[PDB]
């Protein structure tokens, strides 16, 4: 329930405002492409990241134990490498991950290896979806 990701520690009291601030820092200081212009991350890839998290979030809900099973951590490490791969191909989503730190958050989930930590991560990621759609994002 702490998850010190890159600059702050996000408990279940101060993450949605952090995601709000991070997106509000994105859509007022956007990514300049390597071609000349301005590039915003498309809704389809950030939603792809969202259900990429969700297809193991649907398995973490119906568990009672706090230490997650090896199946769940295997899917989490797979989510991390898919975040790396989609991050590698296009730089826009790369510094979306580097700017709002999924990778530090997801490796803190890989460190704590607890149910409530992954739930906090999931609420963090969906709140990034929420405040991405809200501030600036076309609906």
């Amino acid at each position: 329930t702490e998850l010190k990701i890159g600059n702050e520690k996000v408990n279940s009291t101060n993450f949605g405002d952090f995601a709000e601030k991070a997106i509000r820092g994105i859509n007022h200081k956007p990514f300049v492409n390597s071609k000349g212009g301005e590039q915003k991350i498309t809704t389809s890839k950030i939603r792809g990241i969202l259900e990429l998290v969700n297809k193991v979030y649907n398995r973490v809900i119906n568990t009672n134990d706090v230490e997650l099973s090896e199946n769940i951590l295997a899917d989490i490490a797979y989510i991390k490498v898919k975040i790396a791969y989609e991050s590698g191909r296009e730089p826009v989503v790369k510094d979306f991950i580097q700017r709002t730190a999924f990778t530090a958050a997801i490796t803190d989930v890989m460190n704590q290896r607890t149910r409530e930590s992954f739930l906090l991560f999931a609420r963090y990621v969906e709140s990034l979806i929420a405040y991405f759609k809200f501030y600036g994002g076309k609906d």
Binding site: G16, R123, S127, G137
Partner: peptide, 19 residues
């Protein structure tokens, strides 16, 4: 009882009914 979760889902669902 839990605050930023519901306010974020609230912001998202107010966005999606804004039309």
């Amino acid at each position: 009882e839990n605050q930023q979760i519901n306010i974020a889902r609230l912001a998202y669902t107010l966005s999606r009914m804004e039309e």
